[PDB]
Symmetry: C3
Subunit: 647 residues, 3 copies
Amino acid sequence: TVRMNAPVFYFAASFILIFGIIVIAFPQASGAWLLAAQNWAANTVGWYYMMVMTLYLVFVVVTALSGFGKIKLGADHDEPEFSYLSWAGMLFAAGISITLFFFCVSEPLTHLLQPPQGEGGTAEAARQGMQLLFLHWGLHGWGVFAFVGMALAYFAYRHNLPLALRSALYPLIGKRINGPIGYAVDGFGIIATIFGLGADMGFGVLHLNSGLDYLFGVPHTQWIQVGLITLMMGAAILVAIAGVDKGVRVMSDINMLLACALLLFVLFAGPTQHLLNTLVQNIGDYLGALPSKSFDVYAYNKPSDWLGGWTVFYWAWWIAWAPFVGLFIARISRGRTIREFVFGVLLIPLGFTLAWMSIFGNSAIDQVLNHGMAALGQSAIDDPSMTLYLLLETYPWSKTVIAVTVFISFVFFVTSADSGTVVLSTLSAKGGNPDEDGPKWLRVFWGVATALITSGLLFSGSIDALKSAVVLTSLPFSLILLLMMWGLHKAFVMESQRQIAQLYSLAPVSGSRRGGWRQRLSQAVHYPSRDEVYRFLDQTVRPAIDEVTAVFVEKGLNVVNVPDPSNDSVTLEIGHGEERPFIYQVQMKGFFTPSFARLNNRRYYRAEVHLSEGSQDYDLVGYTKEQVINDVLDQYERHMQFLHLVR
Amino acid sequence: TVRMNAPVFYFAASFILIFGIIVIAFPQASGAWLLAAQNWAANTVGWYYMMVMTLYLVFVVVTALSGFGKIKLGADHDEPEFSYLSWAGMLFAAGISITLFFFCVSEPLTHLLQPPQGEGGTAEAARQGMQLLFLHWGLHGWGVFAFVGMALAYFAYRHNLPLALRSALYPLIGKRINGPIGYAVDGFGIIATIFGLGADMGFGVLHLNSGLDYLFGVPHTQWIQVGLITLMMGAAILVAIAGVDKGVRVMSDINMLLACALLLFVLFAGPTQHLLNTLVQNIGDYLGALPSKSFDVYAYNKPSDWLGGWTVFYWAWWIAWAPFVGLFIARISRGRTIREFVFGVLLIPLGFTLAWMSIFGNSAIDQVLNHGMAALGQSAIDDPSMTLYLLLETYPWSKTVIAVTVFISFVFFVTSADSGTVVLSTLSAKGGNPDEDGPKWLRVFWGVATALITSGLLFSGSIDALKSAVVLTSLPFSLILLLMMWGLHKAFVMESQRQIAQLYSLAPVSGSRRGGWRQRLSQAVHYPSRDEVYRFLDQTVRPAIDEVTAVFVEKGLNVVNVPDPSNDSVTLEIGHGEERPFIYQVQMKGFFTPSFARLNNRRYYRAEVHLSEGSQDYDLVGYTKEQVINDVLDQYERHMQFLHLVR
Amino acid sequence: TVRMNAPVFYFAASFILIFGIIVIAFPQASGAWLLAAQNWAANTVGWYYMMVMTLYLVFVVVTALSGFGKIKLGADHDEPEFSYLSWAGMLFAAGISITLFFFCVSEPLTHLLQPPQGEGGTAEAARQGMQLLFLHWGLHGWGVFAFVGMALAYFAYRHNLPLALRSALYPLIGKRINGPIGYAVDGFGIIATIFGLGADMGFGVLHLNSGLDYLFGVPHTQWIQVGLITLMMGAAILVAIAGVDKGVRVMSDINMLLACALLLFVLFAGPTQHLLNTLVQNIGDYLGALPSKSFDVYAYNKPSDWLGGWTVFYWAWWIAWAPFVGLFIARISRGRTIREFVFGVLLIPLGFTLAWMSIFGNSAIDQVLNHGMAALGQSAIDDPSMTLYLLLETYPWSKTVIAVTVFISFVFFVTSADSGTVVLSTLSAKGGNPDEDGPKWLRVFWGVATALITSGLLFSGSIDALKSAVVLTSLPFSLILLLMMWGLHKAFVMESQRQIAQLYSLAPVSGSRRGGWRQRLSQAVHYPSRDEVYRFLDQTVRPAIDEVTAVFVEKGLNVVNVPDPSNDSVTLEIGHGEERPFIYQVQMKGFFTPSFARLNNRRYYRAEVHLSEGSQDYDLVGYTKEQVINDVLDQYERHMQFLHLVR
């Protein structure tokens, strides 16, 4: 039965509430305190983000390209419960929101006129600013979602652990994950999600306010935004507390067909040929620049504040969004292998996002360079939420297309911030059936808690406060994301050696022909003592090795005997001219008696058998002398077939 | 018995004849109509060629670097019938002709003085124009020959299908490939070959005319070229209709020793040190620029017509040459693996071609930059077929070396356009022994049909008409080349799972000790009904599972019984403290009776056996109760050896 | 018992002695003769070094990334005798000496002011000159040590050959390696080591002389250096001839903790933030430029002498150091796999070296560019051994830190040039226990022989003579390093096929149930004649194949008989509708009788059995007719389980 998990709820809500309240009470001081922290972080912890963001991508790619990529996330008789398109659509319509509409047009126009290095307004700035757009929305962002999803699905479907963030710390601290060390890991992952989700409603409120101010005469006042947040959130709470389908699985197909029509309209109502050429140019530029652009911090230029507003903000953003998209996509991916999970997450959404960004960015670069539109390029720097409507009003039927864009962008928010509440409430609950969600009084709580965070940062220097508040609260989660990687590596090496131990144990020798299911059963639970095996080596093994070789010598063969200095080993050897000889060596060894056996025994011995390289080891305790001679013979005949094939 | 295949012959010859005739009749109009189509194609379908040309290379490399690279093209007892050098020589002297001699010197001198971007005449233009020469004659061209050859050899030597182009469409449309859908695939592949072969005789006629005009006083008139085409083709028809060896296999060794002597003369009679340095510089430049130069269309520069005369022409050229070289090299490669086929096609010819191009290009760049020869650099732009003889006349014994060059370049054409006719006639014939060629009245036809195509484009703006006619007729074959890739991928995944199904079927359990070759045979063709297995589970399996466990409990072990809610499953379980337990579960399941069994049965059942992960599944229908207890025992003893190795 | 190996000792010492003597006698002529050879080599054999240095790296990486990377260097029951940190420390403190202290500061300041291309003093020269420092001290240098170590460990621990350089030439020339062809391979590898070790004491004598001249008033005269060489060598001979531990294994831990404290002091007493940023910038620059910078010879620029003093010297240096570090690290790496050896050599020392170089280089670039210190940047060009003490005297407590640097740099030399003598004396000795070193009168000899080489080049144009003498004597060893690669490739392909031949030989068929250990033994050494098998095929195999199929036909199955044209093959076939049929074909074949069998037999025959693709081949000579029918039945039942799984 799902109920609240108090040591997580009270640790997260208490941190959220007073921050919200004291940002609501003192706006002038907080707005000034945040711009100091942004400048400090940009310079002090800029290298750290760039270093940690590439480790995740390299890890997931190397894991999917190796032998571990054939491991099924589940049992061997499990099958996928969704189709491929219905899976990819739900995957895409979870990590996309109105920020795409906020950044599609105004970011390239900013990098064209104010480059991080060089003189702007040229055709080199236009080619350099379209690589930054591909870096910020490319493989680095989608490579951490796959990491978190694949780390959560493994431990939950192959080890029957709960579906939570603290489970990946099991190979390190055992079952202490149900104490005070898991309650902090699961608690630092709600704060990042709340801040990354509340910074996304603020980027949508401005977009919608500008869209309505363009059509009607609605001003940019404060009660307008206060009443707009209410409408944006009441539609997302009432969908979460009233049903799931006609929703989570239907909207994913409804909006995916709304987006494609608009993309095709923009492609076929403009300069189609130019766009088709630049789309192919951008892919080559990105693939060529990828390995050296991942570490660029502009360390030999004059100091500046460019890195903290563009490249560090985006990594903080993706890291804050990871623990939600990962836990949502780890629930619909049962019965798949690791390789087709990774290459399925890194194939379709990446393609659609890059196509969108490239078409919408080049369609505006073409008009600022070639057709002389300075009023379009000035608002991208002054008023960044009206540039899209200035570009779209140069098309046929512009007043009918803007009204459809304002409506299409509104469902992109409701599709994400309704699985947001579901995941955020299933993360704060304890017990119950694994494939079953938490109580539906926590959704109404986590929905109301996000508007309070959003409309405290909107009234404190809207855009820069939103950008600066995410870079701080996403810092303690980057270390948990490394502990999870360590644990996953240990769990992988612990089962790379479980496949070796299952092949080597297939029919080492015969002996079942001796018969007797009652005498073979009593012998299968006995652990012999030290010199009890010594009464086996000299009564059965010694009188046989010296007896089978008698027929060998007087039958044409060269049998190399040695004096025995070991008192336990019984070796036999035969030379075949120049190539490899025939080793057959028995040897006693002792081990520790297992737990489920102790009478206090504490020690036992086994008489192994070794051969040439690439063989198996097995014991003969319980054989009969006539069965030992029949074991050295079919190991010799197996040797003669080996020698026939190498030549 | 090989005979004509009318639905292909009449579909190809009819398309060829009227085009030839109406280009012969109206030269002024056709010469003007072709320069419009060239400019149109260069701009409209430039991105498409660049996209499709990289897919083939990536496909073949990834296929050869994976587990599929160990598949032998033939049966497991097949052996290669040729040596390695004799194989590589025939491979090289098939896709090389007089175009090498036409483009070796005049293309770098053109890229040095008229760069696609920058100011020409410098030492940066010289370094940039030697990367284009390596891109146009490098891995992209040799990567499609390997693709077509490996796709044709697989379906013909592992599935016993004919050696034709339509066979790769078998996994898609079944045996409808012998209808109207294969007759178009095999028909669109003769037109591309005819045009790509007729554009190569025109590049040789000009070379030879200039070579004779240098030595003697032969003008550049029209009857000279008309009478020269006759000599170039009558030597290639009379070799095809009079024999094969002293020819296909001897010329490949004769000309390979003519080329090396000339290369070594040019290397050791010039500035050897400079050439040895620049050869190593060019390799590094190419390998560094490869990943980003594959998608370069110059999309941010001022519009121009450079791409349609240089980079799109070369891809169209290689695509038009693929269906001939591929089908020629798929006939001499029986008994090899995929990896040593791909890495053998991409090793020796690439090396020789790149060495030739680099030495001959740098030897002329060095003289235009450093020694001030403007008359050599002007003819490369005005008269591009005399530059080689202007460079070669600055060497010792120039009149004796030019006469040997004119003779060496003449056999390079006869070595290729005599396997051309052989392949083109074996592609238009039907039936007969697979390793056997079509009738030798079709060679005389396809040889005469190519001169008519060549001397209709020579008299219509010689060089540009030849360049423009290949870009159009090679467009419908690029899509067939993608359908073939789809079919090959399906055929690969259909047999990746045939190796799994052959390992899992090795000795699942014992039972042959029961004896009786007549009673074991009658049982091996029976398909039991539903409740007939129910009369097996309760008479043999239930009275045994509850009977073998009796000895277990009263012998020190923790045997976990469960009430049975399934009415068919009979589960047994044992705990070993903390590590993995011992699952042994039987379960009934039903399948569809196969085709070769139906009395109308239509349905049958089997009683499988499942264990822990990584095991095999098998049925017990036909066991004896004493044989079932002896099967749960040696699966338990196999479990205890597994537990001993993990610890 | 270890003793001298005269054909190597007398071949090496004789070459060393007269060179030393005639360089001591005529300094003016030799100093002038060496600067000619340097300029000649730089221009004539510059491309050769660049080509051969990348082959080693590509070879080792491709070998470690493939299936050969799982081969253990030893026997399957061998275990490592050292920990990981204690192993990596000994690995690092063998190939590091005072040259690090000589080149850490003065090389970047030289590349900043005198670039190989461009204008110096800018922020582009500073970024370009920090990539050369990473190229010269990066993967290329550590990739040849791994190659030599992995080539020496394999042949010595898996084939029981001596631990010497000539053993890798065993797969080529057999056991002629104990004649005049191994005595030259092992002799050309002492000269390279002696010269590379004597050029390292000269780089330390100057460093120490400057360090003492800074503190006290010691001049730069000649008797000072003569008396300083004595002190530098008498401390290295007395440690070699008095003990091993408190030394080889303790100093490796003592100095590794001296280095880290100084690195951390330099990092935390300067501009920490700038250094942390540039450290991350340099890694990306290096990884981006690596593939094209490996072949750069500046072939399109004006001729110069830059390449022979910087990039060719470093490759000659690493090649001359390889045969010592490789043979030292191949002695402490028993019981490891190839992959964890390669990725262990290419992980820790590379990281420490690159961190040191980056911090120490940027800490001085920052002061020459940003703080205006021209007297620091002038001595880097005039007097290159005082720049470190000019940089270090701008820190707190400079006179107390310089005195500790002078002491720390002195043990870095003694840690390397005491395993130098050990390896150099175990390389000139013959016989004895493998893991046992040569006599300790050869260490006193090889130590005295190096001072004579060092103080003949110090007095002949100190720095340039040292740089020029290494480029000449390391040329004949680069070819032996290619012969070793060829031999290693042959040894790898000779055992890739030894794993195939050990899987295919596991239980081909049954027959041991026939019983009789005395009759099964006599049959296991018989080689049948030609028509003796013919009296088996017609008495046992023919009357059975035609007898088992009788039950098949009249039991509902389609059995396809064929007339027999072969007179030896006995084929059986069954169609199953459309999918694969059941082939069971017997066939006679003859082979050559092995060596250890010849009565002169010289020939014998076997009756193999073939099936569908992916099967094993075995003979039936010695079966009974009732055992042959029972073999075709359980191959048919194994076929029906295969067909059930593919569908």
